[PDB]
Amino acid sequence: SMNPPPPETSNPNKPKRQTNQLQYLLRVVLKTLWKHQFAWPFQQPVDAVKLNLPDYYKIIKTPMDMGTIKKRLENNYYWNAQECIQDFNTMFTNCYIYNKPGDDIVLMAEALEKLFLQKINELPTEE
Ligand SMILES: CC[C@@H]1C(=O)N(C)c2cnc(Nc3ccc(C(=O)NC4CCN(C)CC4)cc3OC)nc2N1C1CCCC1
């Protein structure tokens, strides 16, 4: 309140490469998390105006969400799987910083994180 613009998702200046890890992150990791029962609050940027939380972007200076992550993968924005994994981690950490521990939103993030960590453990060897 006001809302910032959403995170950048494309840069045609950035070099691009398709790898088996980035593919997996899109087609497996993002897809499985997106479809989870608890995914819906994490599918787009926090609208702090709509939610009437004017402090949200006073506290969270590195917002991230799965809608942004989806687009960055589509746009070949990431050179490395680690860049993408960091964005997921940022999304979770933001939720943990902003919200009271144990609140339902935190439990929802925790569940998605547990699933994300399981999929990351199965990240294919770079080929
Ligand atoms: C930004 C803080 C935190 C967070 O970290 N994320 C990511 C977040 C992302 N998106 C949402 N979204 C919504 C949250 C609540 C509602 C909603 O309609 N709540 C009803 C209000 C009336 N009540 C009788 C029934 C419940 C709708 C939402 O989006 C349309 N909430 C989030 N929260 C929550 C904000 C309030 C709890 C914590």
From Swiss-Prot:
Tissue specificity, per the record, is: Ubiquitously expressed.
* Site feature location: Acetylated histone binding: N99
Query: Where is this protein found?
Result: Nucleus; Chromosome
Q: Which residues form the Bromo domain?
A: 17-123
Locate residues linked as Glycyl lysine isopeptide (Lys-Gly) (interchain with G-Cter in SUMO2).
Answer: K58
PTM note says: Phosphorylation by CK2 disrupt the intramolecular binding between the bromo domain 2 and the NPS region and promotes binding between the NPS and the BID regions, leading to activate the protein and promote binding to acetylated histones. In absence of phosphorylation, BRD4 does not localize to p53/TP53 target gene promoters, phosphorylation promoting recruitment to p53/TP53 target promoters.
In the record, what disease is this protein associated with? Cornelia de Lange syndrome 6: A form of Cornelia de Lange syndrome, a clinically heterogeneous developmental disorder associated with malformations affecting multiple systems. It is characterized by facial dysmorphisms, abnormal hands and feet, growth delay, cognitive retardation, hirsutism, gastroesophageal dysfunction and cardiac, ophthalmologic and genitourinary anomalies. CDLS6 inheritance is autosomal dominant.
**Please, what other remarks does the record include?**
JQ1, a thieno-triazolo-1,4-diazepine derivative, and I-BET, a benzodiazepine derivative, have been tested on tumors with success. Treatment with GSK1210151A (I-BET151, a I-BET derivative) has strong effets on mixed lineage leukemia and promotes myeloid differentiation and leukemia stem-cell depletion.
| Domain text | The NET domain mediates interaction with a number of chromatin proteins involved in transcription regulation (NSD3, JMJD6, CHD4, GLTSCR1 and ATAD5).
Protein function? Chromatin reader protein that recognizes and binds acetylated histones and plays a key role in transmission of epigenetic memory across cell divisions and transcription regulation. Remains associated with acetylated chromatin throughout the entire cell cycle and provides epigenetic memory for postmitotic G1 gene transcription by preserving acetylated chromatin status and maintaining high-order chromatin structure. During interphase, plays a key role in regulating the transcription of signal-inducible genes by associating with the P-TEFb complex and recruiting it to promoters.
Family as reported in the entry's similarity comment: Belongs to the BET family.
Q: How does it assemble?
A: Interacts with p53/TP53; the interaction is direct. Interacts (via CTD region) with CDK9 and CCNT1, acting as an associated component of P-TEFb complex. Interacts with RELA (when acetylated at 'Lys-310'). Interacts (via NET domain) with NSD3, CHD4, BICRA and ATAD5. The interaction with BICRA bridges BRD4 to the GBAF complex. Interacts (via NET domain) with JMJD6 (via JmjC and N-terminal domains); the interaction is stronger in presence of ssRNA and recruits JMJD6 on distal enhancers. Interacts with NSD3. Interacts with NIPBL. (Microbial infection) Interacts with bovine papillomavirus type 1 regulatory protein E2. This interactions may serve for the tethering of viral genomes to host mitotic chromosomes allowing successful partitioning of the viral genome during cell division.
- What is this protein's name? Bromodomain-containing protein 4
Upper lineage: Eukaryota, Metazoa, Chordata, Craniata, Vertebrata
Q: Which residues of the full protein are shown?
A: 44 to 168 of 1362
